[PDB]
């Protein structure tokens, strides 16, 4: 239920409204932490321990789906116990900042962010794998329907459940911001909650980056195998010849997306393009192949030798201008799906250019 009408029933009247609110938010943090812990334990018991012991899949697949569940559990369990220690000294909780810093600052921040990153980074890929395997293996499918029918799943699928570490982590700044709002300003307590809130955001930043990088590498690995740079070992413009052995697996990817190329007069050419760190790669989609071909225009631009410019009439187009004096006095006009898109694309390109 609810803190006032719950515990604090006798003690509620001698308190201010701001202190009532404050104890509700705390109470919500604490109760939802226990609830999170319980969810991790359903993952453990209903899915992970059974997958292992019955050999539903190889060890190596399973380790990618639950890299470090026991460690994750103990992160949240330890903090939950410290929470309970606190609740013990009376139902009106007092200073809380130290308990927050003990989870979200310093070494504790380094640990949580690493353990969560490791658990989430690969998750989207491992869930596709699980979806495939359900489609293709009658035993795995039967084990899944059965495990998900357990009452503790609360009618959720594994996947509704496994994303909970990530969702939980996103709740912490909100929870802290809302404890802060009802905390007396000018206190050490207030300053320290603000710190804890700032550190939670940073941790989220780190987990964001881990997912990004892990998904992007797997994706680029996929793109490499579909990469036809065959019309390049003998090109017709030395601008493009050095990229005849181009490995996308060695560069970091910033953005990617479909783009229509006004190459000439009311001719167009549908692309899928990769904004990498050093490079813009224009690729043509042959079936399930990705062609790095010429036209003539080169299909690979070095970002330190370009300029990006907007367009006067077309809220979807943008220009790419090779300032490398030995190449295209012709620009590359590219159209995005929409204005928002063209915007996004512009900003990322201007940024990447600046840093190239």
């Amino acid at each position: 239920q609810n803190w006032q009408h719950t515990v604090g029933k006798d003690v509620v009247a001698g308190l201010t409204q701001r202190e009532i609110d404050r104890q509700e938010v705390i109470n919500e943090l604490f109760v939802t932490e226990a609830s999170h812990l319980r969810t991790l334990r359903v993952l453990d018991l209903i899915f992970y321990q059974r997958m292992k012991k019955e050999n539903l899949m190889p060890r190596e697949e399973l380790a990618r789906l639950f890299p470090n569940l026991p460690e994750l559990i103990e992160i949240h369990n330890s903090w939950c116990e410290a929470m309970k220690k606190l609740r013990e000294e009376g139902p009106i909780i007092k200073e809380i900042s130290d308990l927050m810093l003990a989870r979200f600052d310093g070494p504790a921040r380094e640990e949580l962010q690493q353990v969560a990153a490791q658990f989430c980074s690969y998750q989207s890929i491992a869930l596709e794998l699980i979806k495939t395997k359900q489609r293709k293996e009658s035993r795995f499918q039967l084990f899944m329907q059965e495990a998900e029918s357990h009452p503790q799943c609360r009618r959720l699928q594994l996947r509704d459940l496994i994303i909970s570490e990530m969702q939980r982590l996103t709740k912490y700044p909100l929870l802290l911001e809302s404890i802060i709002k009802h905390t007396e300003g000018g206190t050490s307590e207030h300053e320290k909650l603000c710190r804890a809130r700032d550190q939670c955001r940073e941790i989220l930043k780190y987990v964001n980056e881990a997912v990004k990088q892990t998904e992007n590498r797997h994706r680029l690995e996929g793109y490499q195998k579909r990469l036809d740079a065959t019309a390049l070992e003998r090109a017709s413009n030395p601008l493009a010849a050095e990229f005849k052995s181009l490995d996308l697996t060695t560069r970091k990817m910033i953005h990617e997306g479909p783009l229509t190329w006004r190459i000439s007069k009311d001719k167009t050419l549908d692309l899928h393009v990769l904004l990498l760190e050093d490079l813009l790669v224009l690729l043509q989609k042959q079936d399930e192949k990705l062609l790095l071909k010429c036209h003539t225009f080169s299909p690979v631009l070095k970002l330190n030798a370009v300029l990006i410019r907007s367009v006067a009439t077309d809220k979807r187009a943008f220009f790419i201008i090779c300032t490398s004096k030995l190449g295209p006095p012709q620009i590359y006009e590219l159209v995005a799906l929409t204005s928002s898109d063209k915007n996004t694309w512009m900003e990322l390109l201007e940024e990447a250019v600046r840093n190239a």
Binding site: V25, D160, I163, K212, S340
Partner: protein
């Protein structure tokens, strides 16, 4: 059972979490409004059919571009929200939310939701936005944005009063069945 996955998106503070709470409780939380809504399967009936509608909040994911998409797979309907008291939030519908939902949830119906309609005529609200040379979002702006982004439907509601809450979810459920 018929099981459908609903995910609610839009700018922070534009009432996502509150909206999901009133619908699932059928009561606006009197004493305390919770920050947190956990993934939850609600039962709803529409056009006479029983449906398990799985509800996913994204509050707190707005700043994290590569965390949010983890919510998208297998989605059957999107509830895309803006808040009537924030025309900033409406401009982000075509600007941020639509391209992202079209890209990660292709061919998935979208219902555009104007939250907080109980504020279109709150006085305190109108001024603060008259400050910034703004005023509450008007129904026609909402409906035109729906047609512009190709939404299945446009709805407005207020969580405070509950007005239109049920209807949001009923529409969202009809969309998921088409």
């Amino acid at each position: 059972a018929i099981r459908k996955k609903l995910v609610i998106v839009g700018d922070g503070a534009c009432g996502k979490t509150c909206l999901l709470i009133v619908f699932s409780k059928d009561q606006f939380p009197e004493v305390y409004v919770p920050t947190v809504f956990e993934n939850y399967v609600a039962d709803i009936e529409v056009d006479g059919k029983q449906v398990e509608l799985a509800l996913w909040d994204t509050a707190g994911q707005e700043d994290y571009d590569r965390l949010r998409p983890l919510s998208y797979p297998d989605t059957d309907v999107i509830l895309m929200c803006f808040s009537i008291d924030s025309p900033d939030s409406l401009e982000n519908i075509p600007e941020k939310w639509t391209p992202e939902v079209k890209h990660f949830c292709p061919n998935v119906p979208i219902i555009l939701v104007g939250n907080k309609k109980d504020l279109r005529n709150d006085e305190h609200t109108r001024r603060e936005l008259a400050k910034m040379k703004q005023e509450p979002v008007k129904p026609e702006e909402g409906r035109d944005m729906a047609n512009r982004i190709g939404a299945f439907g446009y709805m407005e509601c207020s969580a405070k009063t509950k007005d239109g809450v049920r209807e949001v979810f009923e529409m969202a459920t009809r969309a998921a069945l088409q």
